[PDB]
Structures are given as structure tokens and as C-alpha cells.
Design an enzyme around this catalytic site. Structure first.
Site, PDB file in Angstrom:
ATOM      1  N   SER F  80     -36.579  55.469  -8.028  1.00 42.16           N
ATOM      2  CA  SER F  80     -37.501  55.015  -9.096  1.00 42.16           C
ATOM      3  C   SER F  80     -38.478  53.971  -8.550  1.00 42.16           C
ATOM      4  O   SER F  80     -39.175  54.276  -7.568  1.00 42.16           O
ATOM      5  CB  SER F  80     -36.685  54.486 -10.260  1.00 42.16           C
ATOM      6  OG  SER F  80     -37.490  53.810 -11.217  1.00 42.16           O
ATOM      7  N   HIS F 105     -38.632  59.824  -9.649  1.00 44.25           N
ATOM      8  CA  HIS F 105     -38.438  60.456 -10.979  1.00 44.25           C
ATOM      9  C   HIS F 105     -39.327  59.745 -12.000  1.00 44.25           C
ATOM     10  O   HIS F 105     -39.559  58.531 -11.850  1.00 44.25           O
ATOM     11  CB  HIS F 105     -36.957  60.467 -11.367  1.00 44.25           C
ATOM     12  CG  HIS F 105     -36.379  59.141 -11.710  1.00 44.25           C
ATOM     13  ND1 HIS F 105     -35.295  58.621 -11.040  1.00 44.25           N
ATOM     14  CD2 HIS F 105     -36.698  58.247 -12.648  1.00 44.25           C
ATOM     15  CE1 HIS F 105     -34.983  57.446 -11.560  1.00 44.25           C
ATOM     16  NE2 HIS F 105     -35.824  57.201 -12.538  1.00 44.25           N
TER      17      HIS F 105
HETATM   18  C1  LIG Z   1     -40.828  54.768 -10.707  1.00 44.35           C
HETATM   19  C2  LIG Z   1     -41.160  53.785 -11.818  1.00 44.35           C
HETATM   20  C3  LIG Z   1     -41.726  54.516 -13.018  1.00 44.35           C
HETATM   21  C4  LIG Z   1     -39.945  52.966 -12.217  1.00 44.35           C
HETATM   22  C5  LIG Z   1     -39.014  53.651 -13.204  1.00 44.35           C
HETATM   23  N1  LIG Z   1     -38.413  52.670 -14.097  1.00 44.35           N
HETATM   24  C6  LIG Z   1     -38.295  52.846 -15.414  1.00 44.35           C
HETATM   25  O1  LIG Z   1     -38.315  53.951 -15.949  1.00 44.35           O
HETATM   26  C7  LIG Z   1     -38.123  51.578 -16.240  1.00 44.35           C
HETATM   27  C8  LIG Z   1     -37.104  51.799 -17.359  1.00 44.35           C
HETATM   28  C9  LIG Z   1     -35.835  51.017 -17.148  1.00 44.35           C
HETATM   29  C10 LIG Z   1     -35.084  51.186 -15.996  1.00 44.35           C
HETATM   30  C11 LIG Z   1     -33.919  50.463 -15.799  1.00 44.35           C
HETATM   31  C12 LIG Z   1     -33.494  49.565 -16.750  1.00 44.35           C
HETATM   32  C13 LIG Z   1     -34.231  49.385 -17.896  1.00 44.35           C
HETATM   33  C14 LIG Z   1     -35.397  50.106 -18.094  1.00 44.35           C
HETATM   34  N2  LIG Z   1     -39.393  51.141 -16.771  1.00 44.35           N
HETATM   35  C15 LIG Z   1     -39.473  50.173 -17.680  1.00 44.35           C
HETATM   36  O2  LIG Z   1     -39.321  48.980 -17.425  1.00 44.35           O
HETATM   37  C16 LIG Z   1     -39.761  50.634 -19.075  1.00 44.35           C
HETATM   38  C17 LIG Z   1     -39.889  49.717 -20.101  1.00 44.35           C
HETATM   39  N3  LIG Z   1     -40.149  50.095 -21.354  1.00 44.35           N
HETATM   40  C18 LIG Z   1     -40.274  51.405 -21.553  1.00 44.35           C
HETATM   41  C19 LIG Z   1     -40.144  52.318 -20.531  1.00 44.35           C
HETATM   42  N4  LIG Z   1     -39.886  51.947 -19.279  1.00 44.35           N
HETATM   43  B1  LIG Z   1     -37.840  54.499 -12.473  1.00 44.35           B
HETATM   44  O3  LIG Z   1     -36.644  54.562 -13.365  1.00 44.35           O
HETATM   45  O4  LIG Z   1     -38.340  55.876 -12.186  1.00 44.35           O
END
Ligand SMILES: CC(C)C[C@H](NC(=O)[C@H](Cc1ccccc1)NC(=O)c1cnccn1)B(O)O
Ligand SMILES: CC(C)C[C@H](NC(=O)[C@H](Cc1ccccc1)NC(=O)c1cnccn1)B(O)O
Ligand SMILES: CC(C)C[C@H](NC(=O)[C@H](Cc1ccccc1)NC(=O)c1cnccn1)B(O)O
Ligand SMILES: CC(C)C[C@H](NC(=O)[C@H](Cc1ccccc1)NC(=O)c1cnccn1)B(O)O
Ligand SMILES: CC(C)C[C@H](NC(=O)[C@H](Cc1ccccc1)NC(=O)c1cnccn1)B(O)O
Ligand SMILES: CC(C)C[C@H](NC(=O)[C@H](Cc1ccccc1)NC(=O)c1cnccn1)B(O)O
Ligand SMILES: CC(C)C[C@H](NC(=O)[C@H](Cc1ccccc1)NC(=O)c1cnccn1)B(O)O
Lengths: 192, 180, 180, 180, 180, 180, 180, 180
Positions: F80, F105
Site C-alpha cells: 500500500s 492495491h
Molecule cells: C497506496 C495508498 C493508497 C495507501 C493505502 N492506504 C489506505 O487505503 C488508507 C486506509 C487505511 C489503512 C490502514 C489503516 C487505516 C486506514 N488510506 C487512508 O488513510 C484513508 C482514510 N480515509 C478514507 C480512506 N482511506 B493502501 O492501503 O493501499
């Protein structure tokens, strides 16, 4: 300069050395002063036997300032307050070779005005050299004791209180040109 | 360390929920700054949600005990016990930031305390003299009639700092100094 | 550090719930200040909600043991055991802040303890001699008849500092010092 | 220690959830950097999810109080209170990184608070003047009409940094410096 | 630091619940004070609620091992194991404060331990030799017949310090040095 | 201390779950190493499971802001956010250990967030622009079409380091240097 | 600090439940005292309730590895793994205090571990070779036939120190040194 | 401090459960000892229960990266990932204590992870390439055919150190040195 104790104390084996504000110093400074309380000899940085043998060594610490700082303290409400401050600050290896610990108290107002009497007479001899005369009064002496004393520093700025409050206005005599055969001046500033 | 440099410049920072341990810290700090310089003003910064009446009156009596004037400054909140501590500053030295909130309300039992009715007539007589003491304290420091404060602290009375000045909680709303 | 500077100026700060660990700290502090200067008065600041009888009588006996006079000052609260420790100061040196609360009440089991009736006749004889010892202690230090204290500590007896002076818990309500 | 070297170079790092304890740290840091050099600009780095209105207006008033200009830099998020603190920087010095998020939304009660309807008419009048104060603050700093901000913060208004510049939250989207 | 100055003056402070970690600290302290001066008396302050038999007999054997006499002083409580450690001091040096409580009772399993009946015949033979060893230890140090102690520790036997002297747990009830 | 000696040799160690507090540490470390030597390459070690998008774009923008080249080295995992930060290194300096895992992802809400459908049309428009920004960022750094990355990050796309090189996430799979 | 002065006088104090972290501390301490003086005897104080077989055989192998003789002293309890570590001392140097308890018993799964029967035939073959290794270890150090120890550790075999000497667990019951 | 003196003598102590934070510490320690002396052998002590595959391959790649030979010594346990790290030492320098346990088993999901079947075809393809990579790694270091290791790590394969030598996990079972 530094290591000048040769030109002082083995120049004068009969001497008095005063260590003012020893509580400010570093620990390592009076680790070298542990020699002279045991033996009476000191090793200079140039290799001399600086004898402290007949010297009255006197250390000094105003480790007392609690009551001094107003009649309040750290609680919710004298002599032994500053005794245990020495034990708190210093090492007991240093304090017990010292002969006597002398503690001073806050001066009573009757004790201060005698110091005013001693020090107003010091300038009075220089007045009759010019045939001037400060006619002494005790009302001015009580105000010098009020102004020239505080319970943090007092009886040291008493002499500056004499020269600022008496000797400033005795220069106003010759500002308006009073010499004559002699002028019997009497001064009293207002009450506080 | 920024809390040390507040305290070295004679600023007691309340900050947290007034409980026993928060009251114990401030009374330790009110008396040390009393002993360091009893003629120089202690400043008390208040950002507290309040709570506690014996913790209130521990801080209250100590900041009334000391020789130093207490400059109370409300930062963002003075609620319950903290708004009483905010009024507990010396007159002319009670300050608040312009968007600070002053919340005065009668004492309250957090949670039910059980017991026989003889036990509860005493716990109710206690919160009644907690209530009168909160109003008698806040009447000495706001200049109100203490029945006016009973009418006003009947519910939660949120005061803006400009209308906590009119209420008598604070004496000055702090003007900004941005040299800009 | 403000608790160190209290202790360097011979002020033991009770502060918290009287339990074992709080009693263990004070007895460590009562004896060190006994050894530093046994002729200079230890001051004990009390803002405690009480609790514990063996922790009470650990603090009580130690502050009665030491050569130094114990100046007990009630800050905002001396409930339960702490009010007994507040009376445990030396006569003439028992102080309270004006809005401090003194709460005297008979000993109580926090929570049910189970057992056979022979086990419970002993746990009840224990809290009975906990009760008589609380009243005999508080009669030596308030000058009351110990049956008067049994009538008074039948329920929770909240004392204001002005009426803890009349009760004999404290000897002086502390006047304020604000230059004012 | 990298937070010390930020603070030695006059950078206050918000970083966490704006609550009481986070607000208490920044006001301690805003006033120390005010006392170190009141004519040199304090920089405030904001990566906060917001929260708290009295903690907001504690940080807000203090960064408006100090003589130093506050350079607000949004790092990855300036939500709720943070976005108001982000607009609270001095004009021309409100910055945001290009992929930083600015989230403005009306004040909200986290969780239900119970009470009588007279208690709830006051908690609703409180969040209404929390809402008007959030909009009056954000209208002084964005140059909008405060009814426009009420329409815009009706829901969660996520602003990209390029459209937080157009909204008036920030003044400059930060360009990159990688020598490349 | 008041626990250091107890230990520098050769005072081991028991204080807490006798468990493994409390027993491990005291045996570390009993042997260091054995190595510092084996001919100068170690003082052991006991304010413990007891607990633990292998932790008891770890402290017990170590304070019996060392060359130094152990001066046991009961502060407010010596219950279960701690009353055995209180009797474990050297004769003539077992002290108690006047309102200290000595509680002797037979060993007990805190909570049920499950198992087959062959497993439970051994856990019952263990607490039986825990019981006889508690009584044989307390008979060497009180001068009783160890069947008398079995009759006496059948239930919880609370001893006042004046009747723990008559029982043989302590040798001296400590007289005060302020007459109040 | 091995993390200090990494940082003294200009190595920022990501290591943990990318959240606010982890993002706050790295931006503090990216700017200090920017100020120590802006022309000497910062190395970023990545063993993170990812998480956070505003914490991602806080680390992402800061490592794109600084004058120093960022050498990203994937140790065992870049999932991520981490894998976006892994591609966020400067071209030619994006490294991975041979058995490191790169997991790309689409963004995801950890747990359900409730609300009205007008609230959820905005939280869905947010994760949609979180998704496009994750793909636009990962297309600048991998040289792909950002619709290819949408097809590829539709599910969890685990990349071995040899096929994260072919994908463009990293530029070099690190060869071993055991003198052997 | 009394644990430092044990370790400076080459005394490793086991003290707590033998788990991974307790085993990790002792092996760190067994090898440092091996490097400080490999010809001077390490003393190991054991007051442990045991637990862990891989943590046992981590401590066991390390105290068998080092050049220094290990003087094992049982304080109040040497149960399970700790009784094996107690026998793991060098012959002639295995000591116990007179009221110390030695508890030897076969290895046991704390709690159920689930799985297929092929998984459980291996977890049972593991605790069987945990059992034979516990008996083969305890036969090298007690001089018994390892089938005798299987009969004896069939259940919990509590040994008094005088009958742990006869069993071969220890070599000397420690006599007291109270100069009296 | 015994862990410092291990690290000053170039001994990395694994000790705990291989997770992210444990892997992060060792890679920090593997590279510092690489920079202190890249031609002097790093020793890695392993008493770990394993766990983690990306944390495994973070430690694995780093101990394969560094110029220094890694002397792996199994203390009481090398399980799952730790047995792979135990084989990851340089040939001829892989050691084990005689009663150390080597436990090799295929990778496993701790707990269920939910998802659509397209999500689970990828999490199963991941643990399949976690499984092949665990077997390809353990075939480079044991000299087996990697289908033999698949047959052997089908279940939990506990290896004694003498039969972990025959398996190829370690190269030498450590002989004892107690001068005895
Ligand atoms: C590659 C980038 C998009 C990072 C991605 N991270 C997210 O999806 C994270 C979600 C998350 C992950 C772990 C714990 C809590 C929240 N992004 C966010 O901070 C988030 C916050 N509000 C809505 C949607 N996503 B990873 O999970 O793919
Ligand atoms: C306005 C002044 C009197 C303070 C107000 N009093 C209270 O309601 C709080 C309630 C509270 C707070 C924290 C923990 C336990 C109890 N103060 C009290 O301690 C209290 C206790 N009993 C009755 C009334 N107040 B406020 O709610 O803090
Ligand atoms: C002056 C004192 C004795 C009056 C009050 N005493 C008590 O109620 C306390 C509260 C308490 C503490 C611990 C366990 C159980 C109960 N009572 C006791 O100390 C107590 C302890 N064990 C048995 C019986 N009572 B107060 O709470 O201190
Ligand atoms: C912009 C300001 C209002 C900060 C905002 N934070 C809030 O919504 C917070 C969340 C919260 C916390 C505690 C109790 C109730 C509610 N709002 C408040 O500070 C608050 C506090 N008391 C009553 C009403 N609102 B942000 O989330 O928009
Ligand atoms: C009088 C001496 C023997 C100590 C007494 N014996 C015990 O019951 C204590 C148990 C205990 C009690 C309270 C809190 C924690 C542990 N001693 C033991 O460890 C124990 C263990 N099994 C059986 C009997 N006693 B007492 O209850 O502490
Ligand atoms: C006598 C020697 C072998 C030590 C004894 N061994 C055990 O019973 C211990 C108790 C224990 C500890 C942790 C987890 C599960 C079980 N056995 C083990 O260490 C153990 C660990 N995993 C599987 C099987 N047995 B004793 O109970 O400490
Ligand atoms: C033998 C080597 C490959 C490592 C062994 N494999 C595993 O069983 C471990 C146990 C574990 C650890 C953390 C989270 C989930 C599962 N498997 C993994 O490393 C793992 C991690 N994420 C997904 C799938 N498997 B060991 O950890 O049992």
C-alpha cells in the site's frame, strides 16, 4: 596570573584569606582545598609550597535566603536553616575540617543605627578639616536605617545611602556658595 | 522544555482535567513560586474542562493563600471548577483570550452514588453546600449577589470572553499583538 | 521539581488515595526527615480521599513516632483515613485551608468479603476494633469522648474547616496572604 | 532529536489529533518562540485530523496573539480544527504541500450527550455558536461571506491544496525543490 | 530519594504484597547489606498484606541466612506471610508500632486449582506441609508449641501489637518520641 | 544506538505501519537531513505494511520536496502506502532486496464509516480521488498510463522485486556483497 | 541498585517466570560474566515458578556452555524448568535455602492447542521428546536412571531442600550465618 | 549492560518473536556491524519462535547482504522464520547448542483473512509463493532439493540440533567448554 598565591600567602604566612560565595564554585575547586585544611600546605601549578599554615582561612556562603526572601516560605504557614543548606549543597568531607561555622542573624533596628553612628562619624572628621560641621540628629539616623537596609543585602548599601542622601545635599552648600568661617548645617529629609 | 520555561517565568499551566493529581501539582507550583518571589505575580493559564470540587477548593485556597497576585488567563476553556479558578485571580488581573469559553454550572455528581436515605441526605447536603460554596466563591470574585449566580448556574452557562467580562469572571479580554 | 522542593523544605505531600503504596512512601519520607533534622517540624499536606485502615495506622504511627512535630495542613479534602491523619498532627500545628473539607466516617469494607460465619465473626470483630481504634485515635487528637465520635461518625460527617476547628480536627484555619 | 531541531528553527509541529493536551503543547510552544524572537516567523506544520473546538480556539487565539507571523504549512491533512488553524496563519504565509488535504466541516458532537431538553437547548446553542464562530473565524481568514462557508461546510468539504488556495484556506501551494 | 536513604541506613522496606518480585527485591537487598557490613543490624520495615509461601520462605531464609541481625518493625500491617517475616527477626529486635496489626492465618490457595484427584492429593499435601512449615517457623520464633499455632491460625487471628508481643510475634511495642 | 547511526549516515528507516505518528517522524527526519546536507542523498529504508493516504502523501510530498535525492530501499515489504513511497524515490535510486515484496492495491476504508448518503457520496468521492491520486502518483514514478495501474491495483498486486523492477516500482534489485 | 550489585558480584538472579524474555536476559548475563572472568564462578539465584521448555533449554545450554562454574542457589521455589536449571549447576555447587521448594514435574501444554490429528501427533511427539529431554537432563545432573525420574515426575513432585539433596537436585542445604 | 556488550563484540541477539519491530532492530544492527568492520564475522544468536515472512526476508536479505559472515547460533529454539534465519548463516558457521530445537514448517496465516474469492486467490497465491520462497531459501542453505523440504515442512518438523546438522540447518553442534 592565576597561581598568584605565591605572591600572597607565602609572601605573608600571617594572613587572612576570604573565599566569598563558595557555594557558587565547582566541586573540583575545593577538592584541592582539602589539602590546606588537613596539612596547611598547597601545591601550586608552578610547583610551590604555598603554606596556609598561619592563615585564618574563611569560607563564605549566603546559603540562607529563605526568610531573607520575605517573611514567607515554601509552606502554608533561621540559624539551622542555613546549617542544613551547607549539608545539602556541600560534601561532608569538606565541612568537618573547618573549625567553627558562624551564622549571622537578621539585624535588629537598634543594631543597624549603631552602624549608622559608626559610619556617619567617618565622614564627620573630613568636615571639621574644612571647619564644617554636620550637626548630628537622630531623626535622620532612623531614616538612613530604613533606606540603607533590606533583608537580602542590607548594611552593605548603607554607605551608598549615606553618600546619596547626605553628601549629595551637602554639595548644595557650595553650589549656592556656602563656605564662610563655617556653616553649621543640619539636614532632615522627609518621613517615609 | 516549554513547561519548565513557563514555570521559570512564573506561569502555572493548569491545562488538564481538575482532579486530585492536577490539584496536587498546582498547589506544589503555587507555593514554590510563592517562595521564589512572593511579590512577583504568578500567572495561571487555564485550559481546563473543570471537575472536582475539593480539587477546585484546593487550588482555589492555595492561589488565594499566596502573597503573589494570581494572573488567571483563560486559553480556550474554563469549565466548572476551572471557571471558578478563572474568577479566583486577583481583580484587574483576570484575563481571557477572545475566543476562550467560560462555562459555569452548578456542582454535579458524576455517576450515581448508592446508599441508604440517611446516607443520601448527607451526600445531598454536601452537594448543596458544594453549590452554595461555588456560588459564594463566584460572588466574591464577580461582584454578583450569589442568588443571581444560582439562577445563572442553574444550567450550563457558556460565557464568551467578552460576556465573561460583563459577568465578572474575567477583567480583560486579551488583545492580539501580531506585529502585522 | 516541585515535589522535591517540598521535601527539601520538609513537606511531605500526601495527595493521593491512602493505600499501601501511598503509606509506604510517607513512612519513607517521615523517617528521612526525622533523620535530616529531628528537631525541625515536618509539614504534611493532605488532599486525600482516605481509604485503608492499616495504611492509615502505618502513616499514623510513623508521624507519631518521629521526634519532629507534624504540621498537618488540609488542602481541599481529608476524607476517611486522611481526616484521622489530619488530626494526627501535633496540637497547635493542625491546619486547614478555609474551603478544605474534612470528612470523618466509620470504617467500611469496600466490597463484600465472603466466608463462613466463623470467618465473618472475625472480619466483623476486626472492623469493630477498626472502628474503636479510629474513634480512640480521633478522641486523643480532638479531645472528645470517643462515644461522641461514634455518634458523629455514624454517617459521613463532612466538616468545613471552620467547624473542623470546633470539632478539634484542626487547630487553625489558614488565613490568606495575598499582599492585596 | 528531530522535533527539537524543528523547534530550535522555530517550527511548531502540530502532527496529532487536536485535543486538550495537543493544544496545551502548542500554546506552550507558541509563547516560547514568541519570547525567543517575537519578530521572527513561527512556522506551524499541520498534519492533524482536527477535533476539539475549545482546543482549536486555544491554539487559534495563541497563534493570533503572538507578535510573530505564523507560517502554516499543511503536510498531508488539515481536517476540522486543523483546517481552521491552517487558515489561521498570517496572509501570504499560509502554505500547503501539493497533495495535502484540507477538510472543512461544521462542528459536531462526537457521541451523544444526554440531558433534559433545557440542558440540550444549551448544548445546541453551544454548537450553534461553535458553528458561527468556526464560520466567522474562517471568513476572516479566507475572505468569504461566512454564509458561503456555512453552505460549504454543511457537509465535509475536502479541498485539494490547489483548490484550498482558491478557497482562501492557504495562499501558496508549495513547489518542490529536489535539485533533480 | 527516601527509599535510597532507608537503604543507605540499612533499612529494607517490604511495603507491598509479598509475591515473587517483592521477594526478589528483598533478597537482593538482604545480601547487599550483608556484604556492606555483616555485623551491623539490617532493619526490615513491614507494611505488607502477605501472600506467597515460596516468596515468604525466600525472604525468610535469606533474612535468617545473613550474618546481620534483622530488626523487623511492623508499621501498620503484617498479614499472612508478612507476620511470619515479622516473627523472623532476631529475638529482642522484633518491633511493632502501637496501632500496627498482625494477622496470622493458615496458608490458602488463592483461587481453585483443577486437576485429577492424584494431582489434588499432592496439592493438598503441599499446602499441608505449607501449613506445618508455617507453624514450625512461627513456633521457633514465638516460643509456642506449633499445635497452639495450628489452633490459633485455624482462622484469621488478628493481633494488636500489644497482644502480638504476648503472642511472641514481636518483642517490643515501639514507644513514641512526641507526646502530642 | 543503531537507529541513530542510520540517521547519522542519512538513512531514514520507515519500518512500521504508515500512520500519522510514523509520517510525522519521517517528515521530521526528511527535513533535518535536508538541512544537514541538501546535496547528499537521503536513503529511505522501507519495511512497512502501508496504511494511510494522508500519511502517505505527507511522507510522499516531503520526500519529493527536499533537495536531496531519496534512495528508497525495500527490505522485506512495501505494501500500500509503502509501495508508493518506494516508487517515490528518485529514478535510478529505487532499490529493493531480492526477496522483498511490493504490494500495490487501491485505497480502502479500514472499517465501515456511517452517515447519510450525502455524507457517503463525499466519502466515496474522497476515496475515488484517493484512488486517482494513488494511480497518478504511481504513474509518474513507474512510467505507466495510470489506467494500467487502475487495472493492476484493482486487486492486491504482489510484486516480487525482480518484477517490481519490470513494473517500475524499483530500478535495481540489490545484489549481495557477502565477501564469501 | 541491588540487582546491579548482584551482577557486579557475578550473581545472575532468575527471579521471575521462565519465558522467552526471562531466558533472553539470563543468556545475556551468562555470557557477559563469561567474558568478564571465565574462571570465576557465576552464581545463579533461582526463585522461579518455571515454565517454558525452549526457554529452559536456552538457559540450560548457556549455563552449561560457559567456562565458569554455575552456582545454583534455590531461594524459595525452583519449580518445573527452574528445578532443572537448579540441577543444571555444577556438581558440588548446587545449593538451596532450607525452606526452599523444589518442584519437578513432566512438561505440560498450558492450554489446548487445536489441529488435525497429524498436527497433534507431532505436538505430542514434541512434548514426548520434551519429556525425555527433561528426564535425560535431570538424570545427568541428579545421577538417576531417567526412568526413575519418569516415575517421580509423573505427578508434581515437591521436594524440600533436604530431600532435594537426597534426590540429587541440589548438593548442599545452606546453613544460616546469623552471627546472633 | 549485557546486550550492549554482545553488540560491541559483534553479536546480534534475535531473542524475540520475529515481527516487524524485531526485524527492524536486526537490520539496523546488521548494517552497523557491517560498517564497523565488514571483514569481521557478525554472530547472530537465535532463540526465536519465528513468525512473519516479510520480517523473515527482511532479516534474511540483510544478513545475506552484508560483507561480514553471519555466525548463526541457535540457543534453545529456532522455529518457522527463525530456523530459516538459522540456515541463513554462512556455511561452516551455522551453530546450535546441543539441546536447541529447530522447528521448520510451511508458512501459515495466523487467523482468518476474509474477502472475495478473487481476493483470496491472491492471498493464497501469496502464501504459495511464501511457501516456495521458504523452500527455495532453505534449499540453498541446506543443500536439499526443495521438494524434499516441501515434504518435510508439510507438517511441523522438529529437529534436534544433532539432526538439524544432518538436515543441513546447522553445521556444528556446539561442544561445551565448562573447564569442569
Ligand atoms: C497506496 C495508498 C493508497 C495507501 C493505502 N492506504 C489506505 O487505503 C488508507 C486506509 C487505511 C489503512 C490502514 C489503516 C487505516 C486506514 N488510506 C487512508 O488513510 C484513508 C482514510 N480515509 C478514507 C480512506 N482511506 B493502501 O492501503 O493501499
Ligand atoms: C462548578 C464547580 C463546583 C465544579 C463542578 N462540580 C462537579 O460537578 C464536579 C463533579 C466531578 C468531576 C470529576 C470527578 C468526579 C466528580 N466536582 C465534584 O467533584 C463534585 C462532586 N460531587 C458533587 C459535585 N461536584 B464542575 O462539574 O466541575
Ligand atoms: C478513618 C477510616 C478508617 C474510615 C474509612 N475506612 C474504610 O472504609 C476503609 C476502606 C477500605 C479499604 C480497603 C479495603 C476495604 C475497605 N476500610 C479499611 O481500611 C478496611 C480494610 N480491611 C478491612 C476492613 N476495613 B475511610 O475509607 O478511610
Ligand atoms: C472545527 C472545530 C469545531 C473542530 C471540530 N471537532 C469536533 O467536531 C469536536 C468533536 C467533539 C469533541 C468532544 C465533544 C463533542 C464533540 N467538537 C467539539 O470540540 C465540541 C465539544 N463540545 C461540544 C461540541 N463540540 B472538527 O471535527 O470540525
Ligand atoms: C501465612 C503464610 C503461610 C502465608 C499465607 N499463605 C497463603 O495463602 C499464600 C497464598 C496467597 C495469599 C494471598 C495473596 C497471594 C497469595 N501463600 C501461598 O503462596 C500459598 C500457596 N498455596 C497454598 C497456600 N499458600 B497468607 O495467605 O499469605
Ligand atoms: C520441567 C520442565 C520441562 C519445565 C516444565 N514444562 C512445561 O510444562 C512447559 C509449560 C508451558 C510453557 C509455555 C507454553 C506451554 C506450556 N512446557 C513448555 O514449555 C511447552 C511449550 N510448548 C509446547 C509444549 N510444552 B514446567 O511446567 O515449567
Ligand atoms: C517458515 C517461514 C516461512 C515463516 C513461518 N510462516 C508462518 O506461519 C507465518 C505466520 C504469520 C505471521 C504473521 C501474520 C500471519 C501469519 N506466515 C507469514 O509470515 C504470513 C504473513 N502474512 C501473510 C501470510 N503469511 B513462521 O512464521 O511460522
Amino acid at each position: 596570573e592565576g597561581g598568584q598565591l605565591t605572591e600572597k600567602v607565602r609572601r605573608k604566612p600571617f594572613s587572612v584569606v576570604l573565599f566569598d560565595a563558595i557555594e557558587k564554585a565547582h566541586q573540583e575547586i575545593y577538592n584541592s582545598l582539602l589539602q590546606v585544611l588537613e596539612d596547611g600546605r598547597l601545591t601550586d601549578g608552578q610547583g610551590r609550597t604555598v603554606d596556609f599554615k598561619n592563615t585564618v582561612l574563611i569560607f563564605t556562603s549566603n546559603l540562607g535566603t529563605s526568610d531573607i526572601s520575605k517573611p514567607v516560605g515554601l509552606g502554608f504557614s533561621m540559624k539551622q536553616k542555613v546549617n542544613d543548606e551547607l549539608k545539602k549543597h556541600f560534601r561532608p568531607e569538606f565541612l568537618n575540617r573547618i573549625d567553627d561555622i558562624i551564622v549571622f542573624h537578621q539585624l535588629t533596628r537598634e543594631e543597624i543605627i549603631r552602624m549608622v553612628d559608626l559610619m556617619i562619624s567617618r565622614v564627620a572628621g573630613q568636615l571639621k578639616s574644612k571647619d564644617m560641621a554636620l550637626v548630628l540628629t537622630d531623626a535622620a539616623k532612623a531614616l538612613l536605617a530604613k533606606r540603607g537596609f533590606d533583608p537580602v543585602l542590607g548594611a552593605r548599601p548603607l554607605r551608598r545611602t549615606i553618600q546619596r542622601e547626605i553628601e549629595d545635599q551637602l554639595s548644595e552648600k557650595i553650589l549656592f556658595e556656602e563656605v564662610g568661617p563655617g556653616q553649621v548645617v543640619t539636614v532632615d529629609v522627609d518621613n517615609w | 522544555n516549554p513547561y519548565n520555561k513557563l514555570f521559570e517565568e512564573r506561569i502555572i499551566f493548569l491545562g488538564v482535567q481538575v482532579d486530585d493529581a492536577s490539584a496536587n501539582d498546582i498547589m506544589a507550583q503555587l507555593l514554590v513560586l510563592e517562595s521564589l518571589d512572593p511579590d512577583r505575580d504568578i500567572t495561571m493559564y487555564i485550559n481546563s474542562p473543570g471537575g472536582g470540587f475539593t480539587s477546585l477548593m484546593a487550588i482555589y485556597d492555595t492561589m488565594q493563600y499566596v502573597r503573589a497576585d494570581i494572573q488567571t488567563v483563560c486559553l480556550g476553556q474554563a469549565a466548572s471548577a476551572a471557571a471558578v479558578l478563572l474568577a479566583a485571580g486577583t481583580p484587574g488581573k483576570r484575563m481571557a483570550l477572545p475566543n476562550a469559553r467560560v462555562l459555569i454550572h452548578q456542582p454535579s455528581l458524576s455517576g450515581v452514588i448508592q446508599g441508604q436515605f440517611s446516607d443520601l441526605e448527607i451526600q445531598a447536603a454536601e452537594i448543596e453546600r458544594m453549590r452554595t460554596l461555588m456560588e459564594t466563591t463566584l460572588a466574591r470574585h464577580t461582584g454578583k449577589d450569589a442568588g443571581v449566580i444560582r439562577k445563572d448556574t442553574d444550567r450550563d452557562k457558556i460565557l464568551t470572553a467578552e460576556e465573561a467580562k460583563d459577568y465578572g469572571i474575567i477583567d480583560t479580554v486579551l488583545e492580539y499583538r501580531k506585529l502585522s
